[model samples]
Target: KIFKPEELRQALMPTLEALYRQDPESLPFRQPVDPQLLGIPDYFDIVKNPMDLSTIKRKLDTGQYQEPWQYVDDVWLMFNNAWLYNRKTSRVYKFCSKLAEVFEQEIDPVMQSL
Candidate 1:
């Protein structure tokens, strides 16, 4: 019935980790605060998929995410896992607030459902 945040995060961690591990060369966010908020060396002016966060920003800016909730949800997932993995910051709450701002219409109901 009731589950802690870390419990949920742990369950999803394997999926995301495996997604990254399956294609280390292709997946992004390999490093924290990656340069230009873009990934390494694919050598193109166009932002790459699942790599360049700038691309995500552009999508967010332009209202282009096909499943915008999924984007926000994944960010929350990453926020939760960051706490579990590091246990080292009061910053998670701040991150949550920003996520709220990003998904102003849905954040409350989405969080209440959780």
Candidate 2:
């Protein structure tokens, strides 16, 4: 059959439950990244904008504040200010890559042992 109700439910029900769940610590199993705002408008505005790679790189590497990433509604607040101070998305990507490498370095061996 083209449509299977049980299969669809099994595939997506958990995801819906996590989205509606109030527990912040719960592993979203569905949408892990929550763009929760801090009620600041300006910060988020910059993140929502798609700038040229050159501009983005400058901000990412040198921490240039073209826009106010400090305010609550600023884009940085969406990420819980993990990369505060107008950090460029490129920089965040680089740091995340390094973090993943470090995590893998420590955990891969243990996981392989199993």
Candidate 3:
């Protein structure tokens, strides 16, 4: 079934929260990476276009701004890599992946509604 973003959020909240509680301390990092690794400035900005690995590296080289979320998002979107590298060991990531599948499966219908 198609779901509005609000509906999707609500439907997933319980599962997400339960999974989150399993590893409250180790949820994905809010920062893209350890400080000084990306060398992003205080007011980093994201590019308007979607990025691939090459674009990401190129932008980083120029010291351009990009949001941490955008960097991670582009990586997964472009590569089709689920980052399910160690699902057995990661309670939070595992459940979140399942929830993402739920969203992915419903996206087409949701877009039709939109």
Candidate 4:
């Protein structure tokens, strides 16, 4: 039970920061989606739990997350939304898929024991 709130938060910092800096191909996830310019009028409604890197950072900084897994799920949720909206053949989907592999590598070793 050593996974105290602050400890969990601190432990998760590296993974979070690593995610903040991704290759140029995954640039779209750096910030929240802009439904207007993307010409997707109904994207917001389609994805119920919309997430972005900036929003995750904001929530974590504000101490909105209580568990390490909660924090990890947010990153997955961001990609989950990507899968929900984009097709597998699309460029954005490929980027999201690539990032998911990176995420699995980073998050698993750290969270596995806990």
The digit string of per-residue lDDT tens for model 1 on 1-114 reads 554445444333333333334232213333443435444343232222222234434434454534435545555554454334323444533443444344444345544555
In terms of lDDT, the poorest run of 10 residues in model 1 is 43-52
lDDT of 4 at 19: 65
Over 14-77, each residue of candidate 2 has an lDDT whose tens digit, in order, gives 3223322423322221122324543445645545542222332233344343222221122223
Off by over 4 Å in 2: 1-32, 36-89
Clashing pairs in 2: 40-72, 40-73, 41-73, 43-74, 43-75, 44-74, 44-75
Q: Which candidate's TM-score is highest?
A: 4
Instruction: Please list the C-alpha lDDT of all candidates, in the order they appear.
Output: 0.40, 0.33, 0.38, 0.82
Candidate 4 global CA lDDT score: 0.82
Q: Global lDDT for candidate 3?
A: 0.38
Q: List TM-scores for all candidates, in order.
A: 0.30, 0.25, 0.29, 0.87
lDDT of 4 by residue, 1-114 (tens): 545656766767677777666786468798899999999989988998889888887887778887777888899999999999998898889989988888888888888755
By lDDT, the better pick of 1 and 2 is 1
**Candidate topping lDDT:** 4
Sort by lDDT, top down from the best: 4, 1, 3, 2
Worst lDDT window (10 residues) for model 2?
A: 67-76
Q: In model 3, what is the error at residue 82, expressed in angstroms?
A: 5.0
